[PDB]
């Protein structure tokens, strides 16, 4: 017997354990779950498990790539020791403290908001979750399956879309070595054109979607302006923060008619130019961080592309925009949004 609960969870790792305020324990290796004969409500956003995950990823973010100067929007200028030694993005799992348990909605119908799940399973700890931080797309995620599915905010049109494992989507980024210390390429591999078609078909079928059913009027949409982490895709490779201009990729994946575009942006390519920045806007707190000049050598990173962060925007039945999002936190609501913490009592 139980009741919904809000209490700090304990984290568990396989290798390294300390970062900022966070300290994890060793992973026990048990990923088993037990089926229950009960109906429960689940919600990926109104969720202490994902709320805590967002905070710990933030703690990880500032200790894995060490900033030299922290500039808060308040006006404080804080200097710190910095070098080019960076921690790779880790995986960790959460574990319920004694007297508590973790429920999970084990249902393909789960879309991030489910007032009645009757395929509940219980366990003491969660799956391992990916902690990398990015905008537009999610990389190296743990939730990809042989299907496309959407976590759709129950009270908003915020979404995060899980891309189909079948299409083998990847991204290879490379900043070649020298003897261009601040500019690179990112190559998009896999069957991207079919994966996006399936995203749009999935949206059309969804009960929450009341927009056009003409998939030629459903379009991935770059934000018109704002911070660079919003107008460019934001990612990191070898401890360097990358900002990628995505016009050519959007032209290519949707096979757009580009005649109405400036000549430099008319190209349709599955690779995009990226540049390295030393000043970034922080994603969880208002501020700016300053980092050291980029390292030397050949920088290469190969990732799976597992999710697409977006708002589904329409005001009538004639056009729908899948507007690419810089809401980094949605990544972790996909990673653990099917869990609920309850007090065994």
């Amino acid at each position: 017997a139980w009741r919904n609960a809000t209490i700090p969870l304990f984290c568990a790792t396989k290798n390294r354990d300390t970062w900022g305020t966070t300290q994890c324990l060793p992973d026990n290796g048990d990923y088993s779950e037990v089926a229950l004969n009960v109906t429960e409500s689940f919600d990926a956003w109104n969720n202490t498990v994902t709320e805590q995950a967002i905070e710990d990823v933030w703690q990880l973010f500032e200790t894995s790539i060490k900033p030299c100067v922290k500039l808060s929007g308040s006006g404080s200028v804080i200097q710190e020791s910095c070098d080019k030694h960076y921690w790779d993005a880790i995986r960790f799992r959460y574990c319920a403290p004694p007297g508590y348990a973790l429920l999970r909605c084990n249902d393909t119908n789960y879309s991030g908001f489910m007032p009645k799940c009757s395929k509940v399973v219980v366990s003491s700890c969660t799956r391992m979750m990916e902690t990398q931080t990015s905008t537009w797309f999610g990389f190296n995620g743990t939730r990809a399956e042989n299907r496309t599915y959407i976590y759709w905010h129950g009270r908003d049109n915020r979404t995060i879309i899980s891309l189909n494992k079948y299409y083998n989507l990847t991204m290879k980024c490379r900043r070649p070595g020298g003897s261009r210390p601040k500019q690179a390429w990112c190559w998009f591999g896999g069957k991207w054109k079919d994966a996006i078609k399936e995203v749009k078909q999935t949206i059309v079928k969804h009960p929450r979607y009341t927009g056009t059913n003409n998939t030629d009027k459903i379009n991935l949409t770059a934000p018109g302006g704002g911070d660079p982490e919003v107008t460019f895709m934001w990612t990191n490779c070898r401890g360097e923060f990358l900002y990628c201009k995505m016009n050519w990729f959007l032209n290519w994946v949707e096979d757009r008619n580009t005649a109405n575009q400036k000549p430099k942006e008319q190209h349709k390519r599955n690779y995009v130019p990226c540049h390295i920045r030393q000043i970034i806007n922080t994603w969880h707190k208002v501020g700016k961080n300053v980092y050291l000049p980029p390292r030397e050598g050949d920088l290469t990173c190969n990732s799976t592309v597992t999710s697409l962060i977006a708002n589904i925007d329409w005001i009538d039945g004639n056009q729908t925009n899948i507007t690419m999002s810089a809401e980094v936190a949605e990544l972790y609501r996909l990673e653990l949004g099917d869990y609920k913490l309850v007090e065994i009592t």
Partner: antibody, heavy 126, light 108 residues
């Protein structure tokens, strides 16, 4: 395959009690709404009510509230429709109807019926 | 309590004709409308849901459209098996209600 198999024809008199049933198979009985639908002779379809077997949540059309009781038994994957005191006007065909299952959780937006029972003829007369 | 008004109550057509039925809601139901087919002595069969989505197995000659209050069902080329009665149903407002039916019979 999903199957909704209803009990057979019924002939009763005004004032008697009646329970008709519908046994399901081929899907998780507890995780989907299942409804009862009346079709009077030569007329259209009227939704009477529904139950979510997984937690016994029920809904009734305002015209049938208080005149019928809908229930379910998960151990035998069966839903029941019961009258306490039949009237002649209750003569009709009654359908078991399952709500669309793959609704992404939004049963209040997709409350339509993809699988139906064969129907049960119920005659009430002196 | 939303009322569904189907037009016309009856309609005659021949194999191969293009037929369209109408359904109107007493108030707006967005895109959440379903269409069923019923033949004498048999249970209803679902054809379309959410106004334009075809249930698995339904032949492609069936199509649905509309949003708000005015909806239509269209059969592009009538076949022998398509002569039956058709009901609409709003499926997002408790209590759920059906149209009173539109019968499609053969012409001669």
């Amino acid at each position: 395959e999903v199957q909704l198999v209803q009990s057979g024809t019924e002939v009763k008199r005004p004032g008697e009690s009646l329970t008709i049933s519908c046994k399901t198979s081929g899907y998780s009985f507890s995780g989907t709404w299942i409804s009862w639908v009346r079709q009077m002779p030569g007329k259209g379809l009227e939704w009477m009510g529904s139950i979510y077997p997984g937690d016994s949540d029920t809904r009734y059309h305002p015209s049938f509230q208080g005149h019928v009781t809908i229930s379910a038994d998960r151990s035998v994957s069966t839903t029941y429709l019961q009258w306490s005191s039949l009237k002649a006007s209750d003569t009709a065909t009654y359908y078991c109807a399952r709500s669309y299952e793959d609704n992404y959780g939004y049963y209040d937006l997709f409350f339509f019926f993809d699988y139906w029972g064969q129907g049960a003829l119920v005659t009430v007369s002196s | 309590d939303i009322q569904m008004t189907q037009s016309p109550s009856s309609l005659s057509a021949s194999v191969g004709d293009r037929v369209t039925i109408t359904c109107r809601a007493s108030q707006g139901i967005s895109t959440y409308l379903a269409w069923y087919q019923q033949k004498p002595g048999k249970a209803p069969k679902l054809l379309i849901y959410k106004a334009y989505l075809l249930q698995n197995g339904v032949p492609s000659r069936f199509s649905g459209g509309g949003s708000g209050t005015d909806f239509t069902l269209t059969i592009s080329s009538l076949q022998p098996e398509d002569f039956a009665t058709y009901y609409c149903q709003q499926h997002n407002n408790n209590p759920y209600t059906f149209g009173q039916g539109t019968k499609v019979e053969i012409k001669r």
